Amino acid sequence: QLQARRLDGIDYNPWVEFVKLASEHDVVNLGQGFPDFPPPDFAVEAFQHAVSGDFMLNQYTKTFGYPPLTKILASFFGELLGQEIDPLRNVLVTVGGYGALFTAFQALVDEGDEVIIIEPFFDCYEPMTMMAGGRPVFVSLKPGPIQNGELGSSSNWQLDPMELAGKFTSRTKALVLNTPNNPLGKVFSREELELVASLCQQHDVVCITDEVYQWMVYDGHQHISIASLPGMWERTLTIGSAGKTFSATGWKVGWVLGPDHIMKHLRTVHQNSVFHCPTQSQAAVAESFEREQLLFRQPSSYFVQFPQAMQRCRDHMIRSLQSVGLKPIIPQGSYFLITDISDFKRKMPDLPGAVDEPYDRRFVKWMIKNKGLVAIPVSIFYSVPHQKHFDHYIRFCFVKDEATLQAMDEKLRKWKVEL
Amino acid sequence: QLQARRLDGIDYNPWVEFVKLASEHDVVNLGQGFPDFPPPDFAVEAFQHAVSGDFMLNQYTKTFGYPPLTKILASFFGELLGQEIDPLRNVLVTVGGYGALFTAFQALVDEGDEVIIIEPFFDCYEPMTMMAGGRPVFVSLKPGPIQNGELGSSSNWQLDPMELAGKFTSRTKALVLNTPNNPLGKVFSREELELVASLCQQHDVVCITDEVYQWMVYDGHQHISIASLPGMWERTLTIGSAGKTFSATGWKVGWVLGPDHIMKHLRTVHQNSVFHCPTQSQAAVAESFEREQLLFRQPSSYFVQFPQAMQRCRDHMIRSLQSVGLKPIIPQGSYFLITDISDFKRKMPDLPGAVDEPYDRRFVKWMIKNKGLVAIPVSIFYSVPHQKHFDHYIRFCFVKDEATLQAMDEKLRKWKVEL
Numbered sequence: 001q002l003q004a005r006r007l008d009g010i011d012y013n014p015w016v017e018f019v020k021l022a023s024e025h026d027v028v029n030l031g032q033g034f035p036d037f038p039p040p041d042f043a044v045e046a047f048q049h050a051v052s053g054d055f056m057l058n059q060y061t062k063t064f065g066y067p068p069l070t071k072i073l074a075s076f077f078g079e080l081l082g083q084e085i086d087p088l089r090n091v092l093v094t095v096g097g098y099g100a101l102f103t104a105f106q107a108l109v110d111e112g113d114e115v116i117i118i119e120p121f122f123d124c125y126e127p128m129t130m131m132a133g134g135r136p137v138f139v140s141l142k143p144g145p146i147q148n149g150e151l152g153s154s155s156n157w158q159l160d161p162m163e164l165a166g167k168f169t170s171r172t173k174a175l176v177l178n179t180p181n182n183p184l185g186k187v188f189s190r191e192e193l194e195l196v197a198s199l200c201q202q203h204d205v206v207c208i209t210d211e212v213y214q215w216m217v218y219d220g221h222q223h224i225s226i227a228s229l230p231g232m233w234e235r236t237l238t239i240g241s242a243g244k245t246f247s248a249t250g251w252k253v254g255w256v257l258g259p260d261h262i263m264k265h266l267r268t269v270h271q272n273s274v275f276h277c278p279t280q281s282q283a284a285v286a287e288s289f290e291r292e293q294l295l296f297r298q299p300s301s302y303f304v305q306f307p308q309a310m311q312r313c314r315d316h317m318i319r320s321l322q323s324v325g326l327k328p329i330i331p332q333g334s335y336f337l338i339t340d341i342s343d344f345k346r347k348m349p350d351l352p353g354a355v356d357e358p359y360d361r362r363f364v365k366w367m368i369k370n371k372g373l374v375a376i377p378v379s380i381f382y383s384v385p386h387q388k389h390f391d392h393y394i395r396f397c398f399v400k401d402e403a404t405l406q407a408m409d410e411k412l413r414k415w416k417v418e419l
Numbered sequence: 420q421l422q423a424r425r426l427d428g429i430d431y432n433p434w435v436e437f438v439k440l441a442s443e444h445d446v447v448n449l450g451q452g453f454p455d456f457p458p459p460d461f462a463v464e465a466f467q468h469a470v471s472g473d474f475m476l477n478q479y480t481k482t483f484g485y486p487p488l489t490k491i492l493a494s495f496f497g498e499l500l501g502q503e504i505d506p507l508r509n510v511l512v513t514v515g516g517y518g519a520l521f522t523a524f525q526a527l528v529d530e531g532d533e534v535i536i537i538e539p540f541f542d543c544y545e546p547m548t549m550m551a552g553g554r555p556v557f558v559s560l561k562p563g564p565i566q567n568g569e570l571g572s573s574s575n576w577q578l579d580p581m582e583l584a585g586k587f588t589s590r591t592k593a594l595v596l597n598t599p600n601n602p603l604g605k606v607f608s609r610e611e612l613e614l615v616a617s618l619c620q621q622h623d624v625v626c627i628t629d630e631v632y633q634w635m636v637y638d639g640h641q642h643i644s645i646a647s648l649p650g651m652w653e654r655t656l657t658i659g660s661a662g663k664t665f666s667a668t669g670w671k672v673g674w675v676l677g678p679d680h681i682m683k684h685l686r687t688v689h690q691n692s693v694f695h696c697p698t699q700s701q702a703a704v705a706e707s708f709e710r711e712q713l714l715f716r717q718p719s720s721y722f723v724q725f726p727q728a729m730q731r732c733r734d735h736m737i738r739s740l741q742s743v744g745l746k747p748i749i750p751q752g753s754y755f756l757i758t759d760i761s762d763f764k765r766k767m768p769d770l771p772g773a774v775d776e777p778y779d780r781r782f783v784k785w786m787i788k789n790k791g792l793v794a795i796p797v798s799i800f801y802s803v804p805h806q807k808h809f810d811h812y813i814r815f816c817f818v819k820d821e822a823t824l825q826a827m828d829e830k831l832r833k834w835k836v837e838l
């Protein structure tokens with residue numbers, strides 16, 4: 001073989017496929033998990049300052065992070081986590097939340113280890129486990145009963161304690177937690193986190209916690225970081241994304257926070273893979289966090305204003321999608337909501353596609369080509385054996401400009417007449 | 420073990436002790452392998468434009484590269500290599516030349532594979548081979564004869580054809596070629612490349628070619644890309660660095676060029692590790708290459724002016740360093756020259772050090788502390804078994820501001836005249 005065996009079974013990527021398909025048709029693109037409006041002025045200005053300031057910012061910075069960035073990460077997140085964070089020993093700056101995940105898997109996961117992943121899961125957790133020689137083990141959130149003409153809530157998708165406990169074994173190396181969850185929008189409760197924490201402590205397992213949507217919480221729901229829970233700092237790696245934090249996904253800056261005895265291994269991966277992150281975007285992100293720490297909890301701060309604005313976009317989309325019979329599950333956080341399409345599957349089962357092909361994939365192609373709306377089939381966030389059973393949801397992104405939502409409504413009005 | 424075994428023996432960075440010692444003293448830092456002056460105005464302005472233009476440049480771009488960048492990389496390097504290059508199939512944008520290297524090793528190198536590495540080598544080739552489960556196989560360039568009258572030339576460090584041929588086995592997966600070479604500054608001749616090409620073809624080996632210093636060639640020496648040789652495109656990966664190209668090392672943008680049947684595997688690694696490179700730095704790099712393509716081979720082009728300027732810096736450093744008995748080997752390319760310190764070893768054989776610490780490492784420490792000049796011991800660019808023999812060279816970087824070269828001369832004045 002030319003190629004390494006570690007690449008077995010991970011050459012296909014759904015986003016590569018889906019982005020190509022959407023670009024081939026005239027659509028309102030609610031599949032894109034990023035803003036189509038500008039980042040806040042302070043953030044764009046921060047990047048402008050970084051590229052017009054000290055000329056030496058054009059040259060390499062320190063391997064484990066631009067010092068002003070590690071300093072503010074350690075200060076701000078130390079406060080949030082109720083933890084003393086050493087910028088040199090407990091912070092690593094990475095190429096996005098994505099690179100941070102990769103660094104964690106490559107540092108800790110070895111041949112034969114099991115990694116527990118919670119369905120629905122941000123799809124990369126599976127192939128990253130595989131590339132590191134790990135065996136993915138899946139626990140599935142249980143959609144709650146929906147009654148009295150109500151919409152479901154993401155909060156009511158349950159992490160069953162018996163199910164979760166049954167997935168832990170002597171071979172479990174890590175559990176991957178994503179809260180707020182992409183694609184579902186669930187914000188894990190203290191009780192749910194205590195369940196995860198108790199089992200990670202009992203089995204001596206590391207929790208890799210993907211908290212990129214930390215600030216995107218709605219309806220009074222509170223983000224809780226599992227690393228802040230008793231006994232968890234010493235066994236947790238906490239991941240964030242500047243892009244998802246500051247509505248600047250193209251900046252691709254992320255970080256991992258955690259204890260030195262774990263972090264030293266991620267540093268080893270980092271020094272042997274990218275070595276440096278870009279200097280100037282780090283400077284921009286540091287300046288942006290400084291601004292938010294200064295205004296923390298104040299009504300003028302982005303972390304207060306932006307979630308409030310996006311909650312209005314969420315509510316708008318929830319109302320609109322119902323007009324054509326899609327059934328939203330109300331999210332408590334993230335950029336996303338999912339809609340149940342089971343009524344469509346029942347009444348329009350015979351959409352064309354491959355003999356094995358999940359209904360949601362076929363529905364999304366139908367909707368793009370005939371209705372001019374893009375969504376993401378939720379089955380890509382499920383293990384293959386479960387895709388045939390979770391093929392009746394699709395994911396929309398509501399973090400969009402007013403004009404995009406109006407364009408969405410135009411499409412929905414046309415559909416509604418065609419029902 | 421908490422950590423994965425792939426990290427075995429790759430946690431140490433032998434640079435670090437020198438960076439730390441340098442920071443503790445009043446030094447002229449000729450160890451840093453990057454400019455201490457600004458990038459050219461057109462490059463800095465390109466980045467400024469990218470962060471103050473289309474607001475959507477703040478969001479994600481395409482996974483395998485920002486299209487305007489892959490477009491110009493394909494056209495510009497297609498011309499240079501005499502090769503039809505498709506942006507989508509044959510170009511991958513990466514996190515620097517370093518990320519490009521990592522991506523190639525992770526795609527291709529597997530347990531039980533051998534990788535041929537040419538000494539002195541850019542130090543990461545060894546641990547990257549190790550992390551991917553490969554066995555590094557080392558072949559040393561051998562300096563040709565030079566008398567007490569004249570200086571050696573990098574061109575005269577020879578790759579013995581029969582030595583090289585004997586390194587090849589049924590297990591050889593890749594050969595890593597770095598031209599122009601860091602630390603030595605050798606520019607491989609057409610003859611030397613034809614030899615490498617012949618053995619790679621005979622044994623069905625992939626040539627990973629690190630060409631970050633492409634533009635930094637001196638004394639009328641020409642950069643030849645091995646991928647341009649007959650039959651080589653189908654078995655070569657060619658790596659470049661925006662940072663080394665535009666004197667903007669903190670930008671950390673690189674690329675790999677190659678045939679689809681190999682590139683698809685690097686795409687698999689990429690999509691499962693970083694997914695996106697940052698958008699705006701890619702826009703800046705595209706704009707910078709457009710500028711240089713327009714002015715290709717013209718007197719006003721950076722690719723003509725800059726290496727001419729740096730040749731003058733090289734010449735200044737070669738003369739200056741001889742004042743204290745250092746013996747430069749004249750480089751034909753790169754940012755670097757090495758000096759033989761054998762005369763110091765003879766006169767001052769006993770220097771403070773650890774057990775089996777190579778003389779050059781002890782000498783650099785002595786020089787930093789006592790003379791205020793930083794260099795890099797060349798033994799870090801050798802396999803451990805060969806460090807005993809190649810213990811008497813140190814690396815200087817001459818890509819420095821005129822003020823820095825003046826400051827070098829002040830340190831040399833003090834070395835000669837004081838005490």
Ligand SMILES: O=C(O)Cc1c[nH]c2ccccc12
Nearest residue numbers: 015031032033034098182694
């Ligand atoms: O959920 C999203 O839309 C964001 C997203 C999709 N594929 C990705 C790959 C890398 C980083 C983020 C994403």
Ligand SMILES: O=C(O)Cc1c[nH]c2ccccc12
Nearest residue numbers: 275276450451452453517601
């Ligand atoms: O040779 C140099 O000084 C440049 C250099 C040393 N270590 C490095 C790691 C990544 C990228 C560049 C370098």
Ligand code: NA
Nearest residue numbers: 169170203204
């Ligand atoms: Na255990």
Ligand code: NA
Nearest residue numbers: 588589622623
């Ligand atoms: Na062979």
